[PDB]
Design a protein around this ligand. Structure first.
Ligand SMILES: CCCCCCCCCCCCCCCCCC(=O)OC[C@H](COP(=O)([O-])OCC(O)COP(=O)([O-])OC[C@@H](COC(=O)CCCCCCCCCCCCCCCCC)OC(=O)CCCCCCCCCCCCCCCCC)OC(=O)CCCCCCCCCCCCCCCCC
Ligand SMILES: CCCCCCCCCCCCCCCCCC(=O)OC[C@H](COP(=O)([O-])OCC(O)COP(=O)([O-])OC[C@@H](COC(=O)CCCCCCCCCCCCCCCCC)OC(=O)CCCCCCCCCCCCCCCCC)OC(=O)CCCCCCCCCCCCCCCCC
Ligand code: HEA
Ligand SMILES: CCCCCCCCCCCCCCCC(=O)O[C@H](COC(=O)CCCCCCC[C@@H](C)CCCCCCCCC)COP(=O)(O)O[C@H]1[C@H](O)[C@H](O)[C@H](O)[C@@H](O)[C@@H]1O
Ligand SMILES: CCCCCCCCCCCCCCCC(=O)O[C@H](COC(=O)CCCCCCC[C@@H](C)CCCCCCCCC)COP(=O)(O)O[C@H]1[C@H](O)[C@H](O)[C@H](O)[C@@H](O)[C@@H]1O
Ligand SMILES: CCCCCCCC/C=C\CCCCCCCC(=O)OC[C@H](COP(=O)(O)OCCN)OC(=O)CCCCCCCCCCCCCCC
Ligand code: HEC
Ligand code: HEM
Ligand code: HEM
Ligand SMILES: CCCCCCCCCCCCCCCC(=O)OC[C@H](C)OC(=O)CCCCCCCC[C@@H](C)CCCCCCCC
Ligand SMILES: CCc1nc2ccc(Cl)cn2c1C(=O)NCc1ccc(N2CCC(c3ccc(OC(F)(F)F)cc3)CC2)cc1
Lengths: 139, 535, 55, 203, 223, 50, 50, 51, 92
């Protein structure tokens, strides 16, 4: 987790530099000082990269070299129990349809449709989140 | 001494009468415990509520077209000529305490009655509950559904209303007048004259509070008697066969849950009658032949009729000095529709040839052709219903009214075909999912094989395992299969303390191994009964 | 809870500002949720009784 | 079906072993939170460009920010973040019940924050400022209301995850789910701290 | 007024000359002639925001006003001076009379509405669909003056109810009924729009059926 | 032929889960090294020359 | 990368479906009588206001 | 020494082996194929617009 | 582990020998699984004919007729492709 961390610290450094130079060169040499739109966007994309890179560096320090992060690693080194990978599920399409219902209720100003879409989204997200935890029916 | 009193009353009843044998026989009757089998109950429950509400409404409703000035509380209709029926509907809404609530829950119960009948019909159709033992049931049920629809029409038509009045004008007057040979004669008999005939609303009142509810009650009695004595069908399962009913006896369990379901359905209907406004007739002035509204729909169970009117392309025929109006078409439509609904099991047995006594239901996926046909019928019904709402759909969802009309026109031919194809392939795909889970077992998380980098989903066999890893495939038996280890005994033992605090470890243990033993004993008993059936 | 809801239904039906109030008149708001309260209390009562029976 | 093909305690397990490998769900939620930061960046850009274009009195005369109720809600949000972190601490352990208690009180504090924000919204609305009324009113309401929608989503996640912990034996996967929900809540209240330092402090 | 007409001309010369000629005669196949439309037409059309139309389609929709009350009056006075036509009602002060346009009678206003307005709008003033891409918008938003001017000038596919069909008394009565229906709470719970059968059936099939089927699934088993 | 990327080291219609046999990844282009072992050394030798 | 699947594969299925239906609703501007979005792709502000 | 292979691989596969997969498939490869097919559907919709 | 295999004796009744086979439809015996291709093609032709005949009505516009023509042509093309493939034995 060190290489993909360093990637994000490099991106964070560049974005911080770009935001700082934009702010300095717009606060003066511009008609209305700092643009306040590009400046904030650059600052918070710097923040985006900073959060991701900080988490990656934290994990990398927390983690011993993984086989994937280790050169000269045999395939048998990584062999073993991989985690749960969700098999077939029809809940994603229902979530998409629910959000589409809410989106059309938003575009077409139909507050009833917005509410129905929000209810559908909550129901479908519950179904997805609970899909692999719903215990057997007890009768 | 309540125990002694109960014993004495039982002895009196069994001394005067001798129902011990019969009473035991019904109290022991077994009813399957599938949720879908409760669907029909909803309709019955809704029906009961309607009766209980309907009688109440009869104590305050005066059916008549006698013109009168309101002179009542509702200011926006004062001095306006209205039929006495509309005046009394307004009085119920405003003048009698709870009258708005009572008629509101009555109309909501009518809508739930219709919708639950439709859902029950779909259930029995897709599950094939109409086969050899129970065609007559189907048939009467079909008739029953039809009656409900018409009574609903006669229900919101009772309060002489602009919306309901224009609905009467379109449907009854126009269509009856359109029928070629006797159409005008039927119109004059039904109205005792032309459309505004002064004997329409009283006749509809008689048909709606006395005649049609009585016929529906008689048909419901026949329906429930047949289901009771043609003991309910069941889905395939472990210990379930064509010659037994696996479930819960009537008295301890089935009666309690049925009564609780009636209570909860009544609660849903009361909550709707309070919080949701149904047919706000006061906004709808008294019916006048000239006044109009843009919406002008009937209740959802006749929206398919209205949509069929809208989408049918204005085709008329003109014989020798006679006219055959386009309205005629819808009548024929209904005929065919009903003629195909009432008769369907006989067409099914004539085409397929299944003339066997079928007691085990069929999963809809296991009958791709019938599932596709039912999906096609539901698609056509939905298309027609939304076509009736094409006015409102265009208003809210910005689509040109002509565009919606032509979408419906092309759809009533194309959408059924697409839905049939999709439903057929979907049913076969569900069958293949079942076969795959049988032949491989349930799926789980992925693991990377030790020596090489093979990735395997780490299945779970549902049956005996071969000498090597792969199991012996099982044989499909028409019962649902577990596609998720979720629903098996995997990761399903949360702390039984409480939501906030635990219980002592000894108590949690006792409870969890008790539940484990109970469910294992249930499985063992079902398996032993299954083996004893054949073996 | 079903019992308290039934008692609330009795109390609201006996003592609540029902009756049509002309648009704009003070107390129209109380009327506007009179029938909603009737239905709410009745439905909660019977629904909760049914829920208790099912449980 | 001798005993089992997959010798796993639960049908659902951690998507990667968190001991020697990164918690993959944690990485995914961190990435998504980093993106939602840039969404809030769009909102902040709107507000800031509106601020630059005022005639020296950025909150119009009709609008008068109710700091008396605004400070308490921020305090409640940071307290909810602390209790969420306590819920996480309980989650790393097998103590599902402590996790549930901590997350329930966090949910209550977040709901109280939402209720207080609604109260302040109605107070501002009755005294003039509204979305269709003024540029300040519109930008303020838009930013704070999208944050409030995020808070409501966090409350939804809290209730859903408590229910999920109720329906299965508390697994390391459930602990990771609780941890990612806590990450989302921490993002939510951090964004609120920024929105308070801008809307109410910097003005 | 001289300054009012000057301001109206200034606003007109740079907002609508493209659709309507500089002499207010409609540009062919872009916009109609504004000669004789009147101050009432301008007020209703611009206060509702329709007039900076920005497209030629089946139905010009309502949108936020592009001019403020004073500018609305300036444009309306300009048009009134050019052609001469209906004028927006005004009270003693001089502003666009809105409170004074609420007729006392509502039952008579209700009959007038149902005979004339409900034909396409609704029983209770909601919207309605029209032939091809057109519709009748909801009356909830329109203020009394806007309703009055809409009746007094049929914007597009609206019958123009002259002062002789609906005398100021009848127009005020209809305005009163419209406002009363729009602002009156739906007695008997949340009024699902104004259309009965369609929202009512949809709400049945969603709320009641989902609840009943979910309760059946809870009570019943699966197999 | 002469592919890279580890994507051509699995049955051309890839099995569910993408692999039944994973090569010992030694460079950017494991599939080429698997299918052409003799070039492995060459790949390491001529690489730097450019 | 030699992986069996994507990190959150239900999530990528959700992404695909969210795309399909979002694109469908965006394109559905054409069925409306007014038509689809007339403002340029870039959709600069005042031209996009109500 | 010789393998028993079909003369030509299955062209289409058995009826109804795809619809439920599309509805439920969690396999990334199938989702990518769906992406490509839908994306060219859209690339024709656009492009016809261009024509 | 809480589950048990099920077996069902279902009354079987045509003798499910002509039409569909379990390989094509895994639950052929369990219920109606075959709709003849003849009724397919006849219904498709009837749908196309209905689409054409709706061109005759009361509508001055012609976008509607063109959409009808396009949809009916699509249906006829699908039915023709299916019929040709069936006649040749699902080739091309
Ligand atoms: C109305 C709507 C509301 C709902 C009503 C419908 C409910 C239907 C459920 C069925 C239950 C039922 O029938 O129960 C009766 C049922 C009688 O049937 P059974 O006893 O099993 O007889 C053996 C079979 O009948 C032997 O028959 P089988 O099973 O071998 O096959 C024959 C069968 C063939 O199956 C059928 O064809 C049945 C369908 C009949 C069609 C029409 C029936 C109803 C139509 C009229 C509409 C009603 C309105 O025909 C019947 O059994 C029909 C029986 C007629 C009753 C119909 C019920 C209605 O049970 C009882 O006898 C229980 C009552 C015990 C006596 C009372 C206890 C205390 C006595 C004190 C009295 C006063 C105290 C004062 C102090
Ligand atoms: C506007 C402001 C509203 C903002 C609300 C968003 C709040 C969500 C953040 C909560 C934390 C979280 O997602 O942790 C993931 C966390 C971990 O996933 P898991 O299933 O527990 O772990 C097992 C595997 O990861 C499961 O494996 P897998 O392959 O399914 O992975 C999927 C799973 C795990 O995937 C990840 O964790 C990857 C990172 C992406 C997740 C974050 C995106 C979700 C929200 C996007 C919506 C945009 C706003 O993520 C999901 O459950 C996706 C949620 C579907 C949302 C689609 C919306 C359309 O999920 C939860 O346990 C709780 C999720 C509950 C979300 C509640 C959303 C409802 C909001 C509506 C409220 C109405 C107010 C606005 C009107
Ligand atoms: C990926 C992006 C992309 C692609 C591939 C193309 C491809 C093409 N574009 Fe592009 N174009 C843009 C992106 C793209 N364009 C953008 C972003 C703009 C600016 C938009 C704006 O100003 O807002 C633009 C603008 C633009 C204009 C200016 C229009 C205007 O603003 O006035 C023109 C004019 O000819 C044009 C032409 C073309 C042509 C002739 C092609 C050809 O390459 C297209 C190839 C054609 C096809 C592939 C169709 C063939 C298929 C069929 C006939 C089958 C159809 C069947 C069904 C639909 C069932 N484009
Ligand atoms: C469950 C329902 C599913 C739908 C089922 C049906 C599917 C079949 C679709 C058939 C499409 C047919 C479209 C043709 C229609 C047509 O013929 O009309 C035209 C207008 O074309 C159009 O809009 C194209 C519309 C195409 C959109 C169809 C999209 C499918 C949607 C509906 C699917 C979503 C379903 C979601 C359901 C929700 C769940 C349900 C439980 C022109 O009218 P007009 O407007 O008057 O134009 C005048 C000129 O005439 C005149 O010359 C010119 O001069 C002008 O004046 C002009 O005005
Ligand atoms: C078990 C049943 C539980 C039911 C919940 C009961 C809720 C009780 C609500 C409170 C008491 C009754 C309110 C009666 C007062 C009242 O009616 O409520 C209107 C609101 O109405 C709307 O707009 C909709 C607003 C969106 C929120 C409500 C949505 C609730 C839906 C989702 C519940 C039913 C299910 C439908 C699902 C359908 C989805 C299908 C997938 C509010 O006024 P307003 O907003 O201004 O209405 C405009 C006039 O002004 C103006 O003139 C007029 O012309 C109009 O423009 C009018 O809209
Ligand atoms: C996308 C949503 C639509 C577009 C984006 C909107 C984003 C806004 C987000 C949060 C703000 C909510 C806080 C609302 C409370 C703040 C107070 C206020 O807004 O001001 C009062 C005004 C009247 O002002 P007035 O006429 O001058 O009369 C003054 C009376 N004396 O009410 C209003 O219109 C406010 C109503 C706003 C409701 C927004 C509902 C959002 C839920 C959408 C669900 C997700 C859809 C998915 C789409 C992909
Ligand atoms: C279908 C014929 C028709 C009838 C008759 C009719 N309307 Fe309309 N109405 C329309 C149309 C179309 C519009 C759209 C106006 C526009 O687009 O400029 C409209 C618009 C309106 C508006 C504007 C509301 C807004 O928010 O823009 C009001 C108010 C109104 N009508 C009230 C009435 C009244 C009052 C009557 C009875 C005198 C009536 N209508 C009769 C069709 C009609
Ligand atoms: C007022 C209308 C109706 C009422 C009150 C009603 C009631 C019931 C009930 C309670 C059951 C048993 C429970 C269940 O299987 O769900 C049942 C079964 C049945 N119904 Fe109805 N139903 C109605 C409409 C219909 C319709 C429209 C059809 C067609 C139909 C045909 C059948 C059939 C064939 C059965 C037997 C199913 C079995 O044996 O399990 N019914 N009905
Ligand atoms: C059996 C199925 C029934 C259905 C589907 C049904 C349906 C309806 C509907 C939808 C209404 C409209 C109410 C309104 O809009 O206010 C209505 C009205 C009415 N119903 Fe029925 N009903 C049924 C049974 C009954 C029964 C048994 C009675 C009498 C015991 C009855 C008496 C009435 C009366 C008097 C009215 C008019 C009163 C009013 O509208 O306020 N109904 N019916
Ligand atoms: C509802 C039931 C509908 C039953 C119609 C019974 C029609 C009998 C009278 C026909 C007639 O001679 O009137 C003159 C006619 C208007 O002009 C023509 O002669 C040219 C007609 C060209 C198209 C004919 C297509 C007819 C198809 C129907 C036979 C199918 C009905 C099912
Ligand atoms: C029309 C559509 C409609 N538009 C609107 C607009 C607004 C509103 Cl609010 C409601 N609507 C509706 C509406 O609700 N329609 C329901 C409806 C339709 C037809 C009938 N029909 C019974 C049988 C008759 C008949 C047929 C054959 C006969 O021959 C026999 F059987 F052999 F004797 C005898 C009589 C025809 C009328 C009932 C209800």
């Amino acid at each position: 987790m060190h290489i993909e961390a360093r990637l994000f610290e490099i991106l964070t450094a560049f974005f911080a530099l770009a935001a700082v130079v934009y702010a300095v060169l717009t606060a003066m040499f511009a008609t209305g000082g700092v643009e306040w739109a590009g400046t904030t966007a650059l600052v918070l994309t710097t923040g985006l990269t900073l959060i991701t890179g900080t988490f990656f560096r934290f994990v990398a320090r927390r983690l011993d070299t993984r086989p994937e992060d280790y050169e000269d690693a045999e395939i048998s080194d990584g062999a073993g129990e991989l985690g749960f990978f969700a098999p077939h599920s029809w809940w994603p399409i229902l979530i998409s349809l629910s959000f589409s219902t809410a989106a059309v209720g938003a575009a077409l100003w139909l507050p009833w449709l917005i509410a129905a879409g929000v209810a559908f989204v909550i129901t479908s997200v519950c179904g997805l989140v609970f899909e692999y935890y719903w215990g057997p029916e007890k009768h | 001494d309540f125990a002694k009193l109960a014993a004495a009353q039982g002895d009196a009843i069994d001394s005067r009468y001798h129902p011990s044998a019969a009473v035991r026989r019904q109290l022991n009757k077994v009813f399957p415990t599938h949720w879908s089998f409760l669907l029909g109950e909803i309709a019955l429950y809704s029906f009961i509520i309607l009766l209980l509400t309907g009688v109440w409404l009869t104590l305050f409703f005066d059916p008549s077209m006698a013109h009168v000035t309101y002179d009542g509380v509702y200011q926006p209709l004062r001095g306006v000529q209205m039929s006495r029926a509309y005046e009394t509907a307004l009085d119920i809404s405003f003048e009698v305490r709870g009258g708005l609530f009572v008629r509101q829950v009555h109309h909501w119960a009518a809508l739930m009655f219709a919708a639950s009948i439709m859902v029950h019909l779909a259930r029995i159709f897709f599950t094939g509950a109409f086969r050899r033992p129970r065609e007559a049931n189907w048939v009467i049920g079909s008739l029953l559904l039809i009656l409900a629809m018409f009574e609903g029409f006669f229900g919101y038509s009772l309060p002489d209303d602009l919306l309901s009045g224009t609905g009467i004008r379109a449907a009854l007057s126009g269509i009856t007048m359109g029928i070629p040979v006797i159409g005008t004669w039927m119109h004059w008999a039904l109205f005792g004259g032309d459309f505004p005939g002064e004997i329409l609303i009283p006749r509809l009142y008689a048909l709606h509070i006395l005649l049609i509810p009585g016929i529906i009650l008689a048909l419901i009695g026949a329906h429930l008697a047949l289901v009771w004595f043609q003991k309910h069908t069941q889905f395939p399962g472990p210990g379930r066969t064509e010659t037994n009913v696996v479930g819960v006896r009537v008295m301890p369990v089935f009666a309690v849950k049925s009564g609780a379901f009636f209570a909860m359905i009544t609660g849903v209907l009361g909550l709707m009658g309070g919080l949701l406004t149904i047919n706000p007739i006061w906004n709808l002035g008294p019916y006048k032949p000239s006044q109009v509204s843009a919406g002008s729909q009937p209740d959802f169970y006749m929206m398919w009729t209205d949509g069929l009117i809208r989408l049918w392309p204005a085709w008329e025929f003109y014989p020798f000095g006679h006219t055959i109006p386009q309205g005629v078409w819808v009548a024929v439509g209904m005929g065919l529709v009903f003629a195909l609904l009432i008769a369907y099991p006989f067409i099914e047995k004539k085409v397929t040839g299944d003339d066997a006594h079928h007691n085990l239901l069929q999963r809809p996926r296991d009958v791709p052709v019938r599932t596709a046909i039912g999906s096609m019928a539901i698609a056509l019904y939905l298309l027609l219903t939304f076509a009736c709402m094409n006015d409102i759909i265009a208003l809210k969802f910005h689509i040109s009214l002509n565009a919606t009309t032509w979408i419906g026109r092309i759809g009533m031919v194309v959408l059924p075909a697409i839905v049939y194809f999709v439903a057929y392939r979907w049913a076969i795909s569900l069958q293949r999912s079942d076969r795959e889970v049988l032949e491989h077992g349930v799926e789980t998380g992925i693991i990377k094989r030790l020596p090489h980098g093979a990735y395997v989903e780490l299945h779970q066999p549902l049956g005996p395992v071969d000498e090597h890893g792969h199991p012996i495939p099982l044989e499909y038996a028409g019962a649902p299969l577990p596609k998720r280890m979720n629903k098996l005994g995997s990761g399903g033992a949360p702390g039984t303390g409480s939501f906030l605090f635990p219980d002592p470890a000894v108590e949690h243990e006792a409870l969890t191994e008790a539940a484990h033993a109970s469910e294992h004993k249930s499985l063992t008993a079902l398996k032993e009964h299954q083996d004893r059936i054949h073996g | 809870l079903g019992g308290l809801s039934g008692l609330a239904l009795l109390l609201v039906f006996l003592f609540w500002p029902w009756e049509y109030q002309p648009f704009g008149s003070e107390g129209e708001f109380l009327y506007s949720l009179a029938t909603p309260l009737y239905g709410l209390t009745f439905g909660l009562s019977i629904l909760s009784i049914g829920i208790g029976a099912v449980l | 079906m001798t005993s089992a093909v997959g010798t796993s305690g639960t049908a659902i397990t951690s998507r990667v072993h968190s001991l020697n490998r990164p918690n993959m769900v944690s990485v995914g939620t961190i990435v998504w939170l980093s993106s939602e930061l840039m969404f809030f960046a769009g909102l902040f850009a709107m507000y800031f460009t509106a601020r630059a274009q005022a005639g020296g009195a950025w909150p119009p005369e009709p609008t008068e920010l109710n700091l008396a109720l605004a400070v308490p809600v921020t305090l409640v949000l940071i307290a909810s973040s602390f209790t969420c972190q306590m819920g996480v601490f309980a989650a790393e352990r097998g103590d599902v019940f402590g996790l549930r208690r901590w997350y329930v009180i966090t949910f209550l504090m977040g709901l109280f924050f939402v209720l207080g924000q609604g109260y302040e919204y109605i107070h501002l609305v009755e005294h003039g400022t509204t979305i269709p009324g003024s540029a300040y009113g519109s930008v303020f309401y838009l930013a704070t209301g999208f944050h409030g929608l995020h808070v409501i989503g966090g409350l939804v996640a809290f209730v859903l995850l408590l229910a999920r912990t109720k329906m299965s034996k508390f697994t390391p996967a459930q602990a990771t789910a609780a941890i990612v929900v806590s990450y989302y809540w921490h993002f939510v209240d951090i964004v609120w701290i920024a929105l308070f330092a801008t809307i109410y402090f910097v003005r | 007024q001289s300054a009012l007409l000057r301001t109206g001309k200034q606003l007109f010369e740079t907002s609508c000359v493209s659709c309507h000629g500089a002499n207010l005669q409609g540009v062919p196949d872009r916009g109609p002639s504004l000669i004789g439309t009147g101050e009432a037409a301008v007020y209703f059309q611009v206060s509702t925001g329709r007039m900076p139309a920005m497209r030629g389609e089946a139905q010009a929709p309502s949108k936020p006003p592009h001019f403020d009350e004073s500018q609305i009056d300036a444009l309306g006075a300009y048009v009134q001076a050019n052609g001469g036509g209906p004028t927006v009602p005004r009270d003693d002060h001089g502003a666009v009379a809105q409170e004074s346009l609420i007729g006392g009678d509502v039952a008579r206003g209700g009959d007038l509405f149902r005979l004339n307005c409900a034909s396409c709008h609704n029983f209770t003033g909601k919207g309605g669909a029209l032939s091809s891409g057109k519709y009748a918008p909801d009356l909830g938003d329109a203020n009394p003056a806007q309703i009055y001017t809409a009746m007094l000038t049929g914007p597009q596919n609206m019958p123009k109810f002259s002062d002789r069909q609906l005398t100021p008394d009848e127009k005020r009565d209809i305005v009163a009924y419209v406002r009363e229906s729009a602002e009156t709470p739906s007695y008997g719970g949340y009024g699902l729009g104004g259309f009965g059968p369609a929202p009512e059936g949809m709400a049945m099939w969603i709320i009641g059926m989902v609840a009943a089927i979910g309760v059946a699934m809870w009570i019943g088993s699966r197999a | 032929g002469y592919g890279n990327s580890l994507e051509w080291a699995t049955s051309c219609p890839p099995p569910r889960h993408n692999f039944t046999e994973l090569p010992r990844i030694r460079s950017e282009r494991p599939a080429f090294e698997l299918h052409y072992p003799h070039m492995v050394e060459r790949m390491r030798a001529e690489a730097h020359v450019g | 990368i030699g992986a069996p699947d994507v990190a959150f594969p239900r999530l990528n299925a959700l992404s695909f479906w969210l795309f399909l239906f979002g694109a469908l609703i965006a394109i559905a501007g054409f069925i409306t009588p007014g038509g689809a979005a007339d403002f340029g792709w870039t959709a600069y502000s005042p031209l996009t206001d109500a | 020494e010789l393998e028993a292979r079909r003369p030509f691989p299955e062209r289409m596969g058995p009826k109804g082996n795809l619809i439920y997969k599309l509805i439920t498939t969690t396999d990334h490869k199938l989702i990518g194929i769906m992406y490509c097919v839908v994306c060219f559907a859209f690339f024709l919709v656009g492009g016809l617009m261009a024509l | 582990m809480s589950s048990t295999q099920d077996r069902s004796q279902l009354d079987p009744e045509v003798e499910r020998h002509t039409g569909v086979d379990v390989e094509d439809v895994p639950s052929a015996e369990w219920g109606w699984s075959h709709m003849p291709i003849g009724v397919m093609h006849i219904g498709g032709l009837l749908s196309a004919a209905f689409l054409l005949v709706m061109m005759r009505g009361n509508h001055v516009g012609h976008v509607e007729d063109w959409f009808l023509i396009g949809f009916a042509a699509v249906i006829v093309a699908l039915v023709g492709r299916n019929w040709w493939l069936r006649r040749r034995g699902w080739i091309r």
